[PDB]
PDB file of C-alpha atoms in Angstrom:
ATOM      1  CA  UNK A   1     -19.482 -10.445  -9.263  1.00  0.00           C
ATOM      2  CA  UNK A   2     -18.195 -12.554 -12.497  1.00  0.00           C
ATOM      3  CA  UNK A   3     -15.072 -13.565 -10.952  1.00  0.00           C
ATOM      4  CA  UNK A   4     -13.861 -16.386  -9.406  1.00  0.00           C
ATOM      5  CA  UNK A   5     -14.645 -16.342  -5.719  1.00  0.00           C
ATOM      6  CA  UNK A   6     -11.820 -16.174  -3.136  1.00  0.00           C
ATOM      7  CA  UNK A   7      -9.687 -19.902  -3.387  1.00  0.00           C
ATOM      8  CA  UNK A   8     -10.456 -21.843  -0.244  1.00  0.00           C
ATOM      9  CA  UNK A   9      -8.116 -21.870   2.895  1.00  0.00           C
ATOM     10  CA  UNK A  10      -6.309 -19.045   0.388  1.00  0.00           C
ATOM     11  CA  UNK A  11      -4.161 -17.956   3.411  1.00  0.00           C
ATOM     12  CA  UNK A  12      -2.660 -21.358   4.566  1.00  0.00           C
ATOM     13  CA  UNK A  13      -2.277 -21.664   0.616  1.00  0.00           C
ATOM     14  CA  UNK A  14       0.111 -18.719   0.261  1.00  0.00           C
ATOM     15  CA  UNK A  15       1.877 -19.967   2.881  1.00  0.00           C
ATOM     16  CA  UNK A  16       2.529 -23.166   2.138  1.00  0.00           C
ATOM     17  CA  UNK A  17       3.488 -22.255  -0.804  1.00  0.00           C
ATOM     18  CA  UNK A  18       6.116 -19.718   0.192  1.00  0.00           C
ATOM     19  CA  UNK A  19       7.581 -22.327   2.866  1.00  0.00           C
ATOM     20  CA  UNK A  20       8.289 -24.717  -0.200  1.00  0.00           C
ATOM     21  CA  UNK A  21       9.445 -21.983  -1.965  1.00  0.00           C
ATOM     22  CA  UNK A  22      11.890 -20.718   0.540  1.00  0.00           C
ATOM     23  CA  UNK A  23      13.157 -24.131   1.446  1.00  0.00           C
ATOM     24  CA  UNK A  24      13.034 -26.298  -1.669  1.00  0.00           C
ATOM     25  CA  UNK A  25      12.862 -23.971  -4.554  1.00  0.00           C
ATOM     26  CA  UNK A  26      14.971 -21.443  -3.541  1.00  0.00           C
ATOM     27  CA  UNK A  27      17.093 -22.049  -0.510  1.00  0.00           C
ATOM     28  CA  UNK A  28      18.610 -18.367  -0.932  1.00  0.00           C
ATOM     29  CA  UNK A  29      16.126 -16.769   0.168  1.00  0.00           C
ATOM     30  CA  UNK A  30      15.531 -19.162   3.129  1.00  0.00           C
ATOM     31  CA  UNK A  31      15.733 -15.765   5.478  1.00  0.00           C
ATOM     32  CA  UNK A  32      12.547 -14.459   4.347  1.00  0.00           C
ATOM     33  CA  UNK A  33       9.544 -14.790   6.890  1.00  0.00           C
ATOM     34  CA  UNK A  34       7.048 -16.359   4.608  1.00  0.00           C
ATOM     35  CA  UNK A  35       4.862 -15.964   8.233  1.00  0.00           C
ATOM     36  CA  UNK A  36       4.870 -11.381   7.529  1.00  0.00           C
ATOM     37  CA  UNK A  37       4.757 -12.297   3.465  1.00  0.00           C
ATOM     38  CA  UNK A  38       0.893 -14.210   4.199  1.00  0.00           C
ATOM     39  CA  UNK A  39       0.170 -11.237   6.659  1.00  0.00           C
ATOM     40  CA  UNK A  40       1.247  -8.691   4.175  1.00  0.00           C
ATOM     41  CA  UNK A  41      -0.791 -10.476   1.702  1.00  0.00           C
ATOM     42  CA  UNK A  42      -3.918 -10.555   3.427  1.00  0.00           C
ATOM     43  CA  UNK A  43      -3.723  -6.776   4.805  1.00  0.00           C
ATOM     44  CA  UNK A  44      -3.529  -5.530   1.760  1.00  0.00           C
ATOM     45  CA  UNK A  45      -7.099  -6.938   0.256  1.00  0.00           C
ATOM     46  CA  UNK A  46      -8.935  -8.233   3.383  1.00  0.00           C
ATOM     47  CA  UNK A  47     -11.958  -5.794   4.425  1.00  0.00           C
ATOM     48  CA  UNK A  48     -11.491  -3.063   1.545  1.00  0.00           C
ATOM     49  CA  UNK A  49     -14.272  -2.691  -1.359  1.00  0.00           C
ATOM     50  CA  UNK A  50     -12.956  -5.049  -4.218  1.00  0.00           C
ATOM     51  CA  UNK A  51     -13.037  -2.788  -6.740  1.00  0.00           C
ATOM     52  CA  UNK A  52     -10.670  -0.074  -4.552  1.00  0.00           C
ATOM     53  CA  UNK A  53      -7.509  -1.578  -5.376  1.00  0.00           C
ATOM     54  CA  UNK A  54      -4.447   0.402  -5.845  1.00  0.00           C
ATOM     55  CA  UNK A  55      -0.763  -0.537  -6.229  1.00  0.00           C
ATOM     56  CA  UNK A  56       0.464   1.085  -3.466  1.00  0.00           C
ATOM     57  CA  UNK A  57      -1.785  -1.394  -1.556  1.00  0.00           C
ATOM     58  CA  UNK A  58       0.988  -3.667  -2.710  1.00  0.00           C
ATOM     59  CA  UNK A  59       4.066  -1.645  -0.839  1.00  0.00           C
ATOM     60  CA  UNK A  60       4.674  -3.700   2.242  1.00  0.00           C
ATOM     61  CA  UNK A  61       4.218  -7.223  -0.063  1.00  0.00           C
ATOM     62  CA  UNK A  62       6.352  -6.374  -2.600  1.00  0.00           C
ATOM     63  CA  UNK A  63       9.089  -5.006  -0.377  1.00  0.00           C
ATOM     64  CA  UNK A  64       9.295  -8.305   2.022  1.00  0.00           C
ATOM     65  CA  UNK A  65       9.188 -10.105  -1.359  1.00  0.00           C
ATOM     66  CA  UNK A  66      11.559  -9.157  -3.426  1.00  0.00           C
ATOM     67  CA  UNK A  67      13.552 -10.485  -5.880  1.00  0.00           C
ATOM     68  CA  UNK A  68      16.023 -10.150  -9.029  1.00  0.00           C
ATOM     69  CA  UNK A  69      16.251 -12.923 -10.967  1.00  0.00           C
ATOM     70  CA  UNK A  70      20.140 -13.462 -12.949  1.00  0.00           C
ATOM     71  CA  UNK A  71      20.742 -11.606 -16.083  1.00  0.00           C
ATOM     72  CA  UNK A  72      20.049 -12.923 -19.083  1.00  0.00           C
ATOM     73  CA  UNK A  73      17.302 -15.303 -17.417  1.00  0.00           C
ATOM     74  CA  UNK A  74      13.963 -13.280 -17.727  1.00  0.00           C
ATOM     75  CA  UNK A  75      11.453 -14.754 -19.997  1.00  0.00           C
ATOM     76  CA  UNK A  76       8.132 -14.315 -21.051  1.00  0.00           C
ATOM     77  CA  UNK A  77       5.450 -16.287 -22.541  1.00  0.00           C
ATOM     78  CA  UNK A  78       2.557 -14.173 -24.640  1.00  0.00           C
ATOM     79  CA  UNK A  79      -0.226 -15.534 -25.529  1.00  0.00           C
ATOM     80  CA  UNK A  80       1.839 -19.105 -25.603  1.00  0.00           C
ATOM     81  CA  UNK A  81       1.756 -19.597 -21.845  1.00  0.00           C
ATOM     82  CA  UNK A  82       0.364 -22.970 -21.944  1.00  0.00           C
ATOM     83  CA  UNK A  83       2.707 -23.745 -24.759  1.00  0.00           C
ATOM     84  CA  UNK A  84       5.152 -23.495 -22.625  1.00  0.00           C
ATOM     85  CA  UNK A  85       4.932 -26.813 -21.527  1.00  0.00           C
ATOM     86  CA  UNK A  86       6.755 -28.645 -24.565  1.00  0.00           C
ATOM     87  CA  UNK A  87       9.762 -26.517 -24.424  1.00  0.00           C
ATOM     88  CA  UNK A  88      10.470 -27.491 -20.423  1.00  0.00           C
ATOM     89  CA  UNK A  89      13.628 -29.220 -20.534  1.00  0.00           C
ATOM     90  CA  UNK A  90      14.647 -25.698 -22.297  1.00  0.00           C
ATOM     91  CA  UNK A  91      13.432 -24.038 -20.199  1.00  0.00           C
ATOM     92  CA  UNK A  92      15.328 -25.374 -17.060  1.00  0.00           C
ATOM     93  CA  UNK A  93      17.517 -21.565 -16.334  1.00  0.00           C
ATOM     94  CA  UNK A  94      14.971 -19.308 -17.362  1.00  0.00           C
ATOM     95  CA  UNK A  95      12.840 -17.589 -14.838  1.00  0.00           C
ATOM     96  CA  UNK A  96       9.086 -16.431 -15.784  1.00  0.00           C
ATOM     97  CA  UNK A  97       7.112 -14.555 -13.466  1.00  0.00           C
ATOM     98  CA  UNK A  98       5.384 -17.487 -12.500  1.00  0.00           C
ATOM     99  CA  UNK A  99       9.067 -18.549 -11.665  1.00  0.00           C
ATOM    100  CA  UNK A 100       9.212 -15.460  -9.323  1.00  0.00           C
ATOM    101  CA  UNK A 101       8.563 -16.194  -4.810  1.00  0.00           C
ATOM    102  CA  UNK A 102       5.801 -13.522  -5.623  1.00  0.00           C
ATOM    103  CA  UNK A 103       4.643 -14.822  -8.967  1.00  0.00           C
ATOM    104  CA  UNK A 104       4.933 -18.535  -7.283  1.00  0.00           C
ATOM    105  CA  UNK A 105       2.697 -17.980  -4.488  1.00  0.00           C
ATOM    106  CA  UNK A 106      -0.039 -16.641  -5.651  1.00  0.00           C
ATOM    107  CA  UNK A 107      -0.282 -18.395  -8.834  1.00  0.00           C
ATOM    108  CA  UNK A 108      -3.530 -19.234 -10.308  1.00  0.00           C
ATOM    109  CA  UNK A 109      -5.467 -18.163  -6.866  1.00  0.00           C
ATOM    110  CA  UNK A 110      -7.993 -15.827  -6.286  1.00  0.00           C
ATOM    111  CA  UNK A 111      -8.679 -13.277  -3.602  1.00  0.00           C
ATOM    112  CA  UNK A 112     -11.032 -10.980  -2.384  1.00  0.00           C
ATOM    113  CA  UNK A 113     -11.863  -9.083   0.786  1.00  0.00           C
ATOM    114  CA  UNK A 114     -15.577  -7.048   1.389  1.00  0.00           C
ATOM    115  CA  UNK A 115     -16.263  -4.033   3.540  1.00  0.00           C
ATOM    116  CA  UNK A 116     -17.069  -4.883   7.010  1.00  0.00           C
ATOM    117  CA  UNK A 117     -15.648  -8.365   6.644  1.00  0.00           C
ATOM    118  CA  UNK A 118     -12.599  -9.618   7.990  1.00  0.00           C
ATOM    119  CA  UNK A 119     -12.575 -12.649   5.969  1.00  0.00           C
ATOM    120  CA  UNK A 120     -11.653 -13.397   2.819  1.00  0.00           C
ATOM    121  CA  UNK A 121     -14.533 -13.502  -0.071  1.00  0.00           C
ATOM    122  CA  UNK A 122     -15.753 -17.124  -0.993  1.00  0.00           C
ATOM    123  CA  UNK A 123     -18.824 -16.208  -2.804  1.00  0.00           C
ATOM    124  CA  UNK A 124     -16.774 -14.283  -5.803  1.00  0.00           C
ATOM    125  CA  UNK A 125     -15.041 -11.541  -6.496  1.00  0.00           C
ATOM    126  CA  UNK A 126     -14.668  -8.698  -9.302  1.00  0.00           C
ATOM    127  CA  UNK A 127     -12.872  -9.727 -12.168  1.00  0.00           C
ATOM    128  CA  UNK A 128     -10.902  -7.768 -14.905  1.00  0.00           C
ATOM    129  CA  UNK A 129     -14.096  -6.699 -17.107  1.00  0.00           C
ATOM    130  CA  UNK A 130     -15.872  -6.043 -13.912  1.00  0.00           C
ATOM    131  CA  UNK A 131     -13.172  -3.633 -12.731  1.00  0.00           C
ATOM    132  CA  UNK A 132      -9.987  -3.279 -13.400  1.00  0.00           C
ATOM    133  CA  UNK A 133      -9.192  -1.987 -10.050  1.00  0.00           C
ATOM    134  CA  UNK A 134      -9.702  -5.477  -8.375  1.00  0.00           C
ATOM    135  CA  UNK A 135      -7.058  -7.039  -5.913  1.00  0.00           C
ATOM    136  CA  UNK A 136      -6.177  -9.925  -8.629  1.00  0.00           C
ATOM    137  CA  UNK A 137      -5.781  -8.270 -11.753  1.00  0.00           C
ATOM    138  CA  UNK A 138      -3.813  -4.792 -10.006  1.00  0.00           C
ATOM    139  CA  UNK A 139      -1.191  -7.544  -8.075  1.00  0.00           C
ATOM    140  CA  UNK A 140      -0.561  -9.135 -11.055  1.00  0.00           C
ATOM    141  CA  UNK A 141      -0.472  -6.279 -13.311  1.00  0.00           C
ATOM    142  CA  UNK A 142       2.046  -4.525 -10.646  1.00  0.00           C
ATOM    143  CA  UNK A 143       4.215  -8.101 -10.444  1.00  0.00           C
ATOM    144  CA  UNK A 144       4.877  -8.128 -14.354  1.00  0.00           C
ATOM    145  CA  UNK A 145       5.691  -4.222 -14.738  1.00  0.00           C
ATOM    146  CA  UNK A 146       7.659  -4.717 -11.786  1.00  0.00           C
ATOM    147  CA  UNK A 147       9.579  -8.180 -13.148  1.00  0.00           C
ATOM    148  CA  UNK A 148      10.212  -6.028 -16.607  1.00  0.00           C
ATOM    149  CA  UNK A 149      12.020  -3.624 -14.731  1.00  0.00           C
ATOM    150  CA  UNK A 150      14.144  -5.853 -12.617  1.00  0.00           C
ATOM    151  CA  UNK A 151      14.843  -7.784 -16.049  1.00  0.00           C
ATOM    152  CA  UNK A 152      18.393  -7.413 -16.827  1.00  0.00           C
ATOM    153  CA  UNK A 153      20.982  -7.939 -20.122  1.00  0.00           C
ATOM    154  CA  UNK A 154      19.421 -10.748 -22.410  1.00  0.00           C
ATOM    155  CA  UNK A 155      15.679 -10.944 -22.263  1.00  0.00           C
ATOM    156  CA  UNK A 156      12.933 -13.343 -24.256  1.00  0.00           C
ATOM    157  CA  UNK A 157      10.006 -13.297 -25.325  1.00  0.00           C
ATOM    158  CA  UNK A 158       7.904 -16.481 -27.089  1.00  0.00           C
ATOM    159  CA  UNK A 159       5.295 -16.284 -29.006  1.00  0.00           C
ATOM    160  CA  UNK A 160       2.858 -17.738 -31.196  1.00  0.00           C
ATOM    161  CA  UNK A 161       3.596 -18.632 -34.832  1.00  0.00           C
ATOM    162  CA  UNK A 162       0.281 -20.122 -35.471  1.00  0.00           C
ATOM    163  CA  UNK A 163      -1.527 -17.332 -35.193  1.00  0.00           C
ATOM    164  CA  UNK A 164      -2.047 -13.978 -37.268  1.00  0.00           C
ATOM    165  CA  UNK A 165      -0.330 -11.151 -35.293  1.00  0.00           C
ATOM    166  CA  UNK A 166       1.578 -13.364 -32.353  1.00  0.00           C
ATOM    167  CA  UNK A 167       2.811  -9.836 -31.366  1.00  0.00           C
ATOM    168  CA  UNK A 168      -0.298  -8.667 -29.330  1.00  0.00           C
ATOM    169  CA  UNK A 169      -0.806  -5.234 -28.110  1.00  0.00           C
ATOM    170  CA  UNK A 170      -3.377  -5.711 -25.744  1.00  0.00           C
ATOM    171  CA  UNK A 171      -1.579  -8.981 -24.483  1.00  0.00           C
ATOM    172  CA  UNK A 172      -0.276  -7.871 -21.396  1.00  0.00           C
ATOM    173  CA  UNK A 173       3.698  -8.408 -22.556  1.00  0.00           C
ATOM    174  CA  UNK A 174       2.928  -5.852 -25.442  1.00  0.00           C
ATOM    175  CA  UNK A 175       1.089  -3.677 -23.581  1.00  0.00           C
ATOM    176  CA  UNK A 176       2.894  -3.468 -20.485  1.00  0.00           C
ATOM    177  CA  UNK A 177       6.005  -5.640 -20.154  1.00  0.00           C
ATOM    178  CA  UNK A 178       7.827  -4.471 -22.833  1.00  0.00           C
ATOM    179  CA  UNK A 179       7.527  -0.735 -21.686  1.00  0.00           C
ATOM    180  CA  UNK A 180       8.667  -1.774 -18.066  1.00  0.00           C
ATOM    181  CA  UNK A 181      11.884  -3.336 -19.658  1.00  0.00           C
ATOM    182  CA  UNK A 182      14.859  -0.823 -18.753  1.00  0.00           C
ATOM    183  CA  UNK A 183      17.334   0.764 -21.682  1.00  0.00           C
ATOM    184  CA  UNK A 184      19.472   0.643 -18.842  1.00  0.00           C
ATOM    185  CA  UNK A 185      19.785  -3.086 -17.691  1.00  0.00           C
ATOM    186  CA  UNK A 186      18.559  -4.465 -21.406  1.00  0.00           C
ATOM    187  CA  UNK A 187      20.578  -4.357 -23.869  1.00  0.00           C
ATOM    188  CA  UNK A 188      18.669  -6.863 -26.322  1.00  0.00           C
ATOM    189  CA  UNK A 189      15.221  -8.555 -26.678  1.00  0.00           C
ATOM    190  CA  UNK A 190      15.539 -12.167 -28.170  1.00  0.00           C
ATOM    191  CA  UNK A 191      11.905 -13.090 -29.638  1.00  0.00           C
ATOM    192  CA  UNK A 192      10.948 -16.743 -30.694  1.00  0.00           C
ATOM    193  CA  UNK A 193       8.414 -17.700 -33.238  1.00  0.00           C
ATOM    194  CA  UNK A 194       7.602 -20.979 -32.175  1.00  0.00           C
ATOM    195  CA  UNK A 195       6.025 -23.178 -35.252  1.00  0.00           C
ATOM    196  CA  UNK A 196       4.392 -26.608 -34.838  1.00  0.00           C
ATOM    197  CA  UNK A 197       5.996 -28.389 -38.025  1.00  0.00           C
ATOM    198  CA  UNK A 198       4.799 -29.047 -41.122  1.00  0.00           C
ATOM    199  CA  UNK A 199       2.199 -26.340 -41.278  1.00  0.00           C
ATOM    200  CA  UNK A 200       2.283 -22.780 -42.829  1.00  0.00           C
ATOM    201  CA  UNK A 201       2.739 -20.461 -40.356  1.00  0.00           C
ATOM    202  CA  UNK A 202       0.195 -17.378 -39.806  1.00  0.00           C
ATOM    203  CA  UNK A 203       2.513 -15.042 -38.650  1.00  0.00           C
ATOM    204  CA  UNK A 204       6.772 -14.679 -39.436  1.00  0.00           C
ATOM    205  CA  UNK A 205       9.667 -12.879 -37.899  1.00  0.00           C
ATOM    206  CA  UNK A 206       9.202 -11.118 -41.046  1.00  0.00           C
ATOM    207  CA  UNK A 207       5.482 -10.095 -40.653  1.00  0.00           C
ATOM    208  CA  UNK A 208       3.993  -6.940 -39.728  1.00  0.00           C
ATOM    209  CA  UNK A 209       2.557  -7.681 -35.986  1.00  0.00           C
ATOM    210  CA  UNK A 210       6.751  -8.009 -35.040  1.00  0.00           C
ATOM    211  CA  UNK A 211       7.612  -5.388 -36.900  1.00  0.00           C
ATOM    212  CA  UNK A 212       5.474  -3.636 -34.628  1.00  0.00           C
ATOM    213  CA  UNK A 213       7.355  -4.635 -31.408  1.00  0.00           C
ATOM    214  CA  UNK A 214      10.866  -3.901 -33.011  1.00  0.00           C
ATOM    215  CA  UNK A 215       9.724  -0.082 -33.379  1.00  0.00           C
ATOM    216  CA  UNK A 216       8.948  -0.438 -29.723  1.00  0.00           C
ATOM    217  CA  UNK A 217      12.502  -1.563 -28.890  1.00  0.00           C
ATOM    218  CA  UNK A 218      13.987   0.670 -31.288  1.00  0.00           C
ATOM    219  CA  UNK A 219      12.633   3.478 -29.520  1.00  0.00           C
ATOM    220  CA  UNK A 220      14.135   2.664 -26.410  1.00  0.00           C
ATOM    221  CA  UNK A 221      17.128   1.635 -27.722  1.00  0.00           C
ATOM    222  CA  UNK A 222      16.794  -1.757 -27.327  1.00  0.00           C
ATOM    223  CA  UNK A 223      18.439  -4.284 -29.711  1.00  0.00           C
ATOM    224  CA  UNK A 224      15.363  -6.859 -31.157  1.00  0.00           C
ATOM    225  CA  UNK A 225      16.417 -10.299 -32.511  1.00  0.00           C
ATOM    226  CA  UNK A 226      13.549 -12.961 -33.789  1.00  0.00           C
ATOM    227  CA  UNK A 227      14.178 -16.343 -34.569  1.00  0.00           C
ATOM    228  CA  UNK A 228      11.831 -19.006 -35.305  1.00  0.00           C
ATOM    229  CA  UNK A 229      11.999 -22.070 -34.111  1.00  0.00           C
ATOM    230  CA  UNK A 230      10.142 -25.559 -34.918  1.00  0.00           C
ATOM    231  CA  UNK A 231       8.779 -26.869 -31.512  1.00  0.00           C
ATOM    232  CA  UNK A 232      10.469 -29.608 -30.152  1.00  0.00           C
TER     233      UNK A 232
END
């Protein structure tokens, strides 16, 4: 396969990571066993073909590790994720999905299983353009629709000013998120156009690629607000 192979010692990873998360990050959820989270985890991939994958191998996970973030605190970065590092001491309230105990764990791992094997795959494993019904790409297509949904009153989206069309509908936020997001808990969409300054921007709150995305929110009857902002 193209992919990346299956992250080394990916099980103590995951949890590790959800004992931090459950003590230091988020004491509230302190009663979770992260111990039946890495189980859950590992069930659902280990020893299946790695191009099987189906949400609803996801139940069990997602149910032991759930979560709803505060209103008004669901954000998304498209296509700007690893802008998101200047705007940090913003950012301080706002959860992403990153920001998530699901989205936190299994952040920028990989995992695999193979039929017969009870062991996790270290050799690679089948990404996105290989199939799209891989382990990886389904958990964290199902953890974004899934965040969308749970998203509730004020949500925001940033994206790119420096590029032509920073509304993207085969970015994952345009073509998933922002169908997931609920008339019923939403009432608006706040989008950013984040600028570097002192350069003409490619794309406006005025342009035609966020145009696009207020029809999309309109149609739902969601209200759409876009400001733009100069980086700090």
């Amino acid at each position: 396969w193209n992919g990346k192979g299956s992250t080394v010692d990916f099980q103590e990873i995951i949890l590790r990571r959800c004992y931090t998360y459950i003590r230091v990050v988020q004491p509230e959820l302190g009663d979770r066993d992260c111990q039946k989270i890495k189980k859950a985890f590992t069930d659902a991939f280990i020893s299946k073909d790695p191009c099987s994958a189906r949400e609803e191998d996801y139940d069990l996970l997602m149910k032991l590790g759930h979560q709803t973030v505060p209103c008004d605190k669901t954000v998304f970065w498209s296509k700007t994720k690893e802008l998101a590092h200047q705007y940090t001491k913003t950012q301080k309230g706002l959860f992403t999905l990153e920001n998530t105990l699901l989205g936190y764990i299994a952040d920028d791992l990989s995992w695999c299983g193979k039929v017969g094997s009870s062991e996790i795959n270290l050799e690679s494993c089948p990404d996105r353009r290989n199939c799209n019904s891989n382990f990886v790409s389904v958990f964290w297509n199902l953890l974004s629709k899934r965040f969308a949904e749970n998203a509730c009153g004020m949500v925001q989206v940033f994206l790119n000013g420096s590029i032509s069309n920073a509304f993207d509908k085969t970015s994952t936020f345009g073509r998933v998120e922002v169908h997931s997001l609920q008339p019923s808990k939403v009432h608006t969409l706040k989008a950013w156009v984040i600028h570097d300054s002192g350069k003409t921007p490619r794309d406006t709150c005025s342009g035609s690629s966020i145009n696009e995305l207020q029809l999309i929110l309109r149609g739902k009857n969601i209200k759409f607000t876009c400001q733009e902002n100069y980086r700090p």
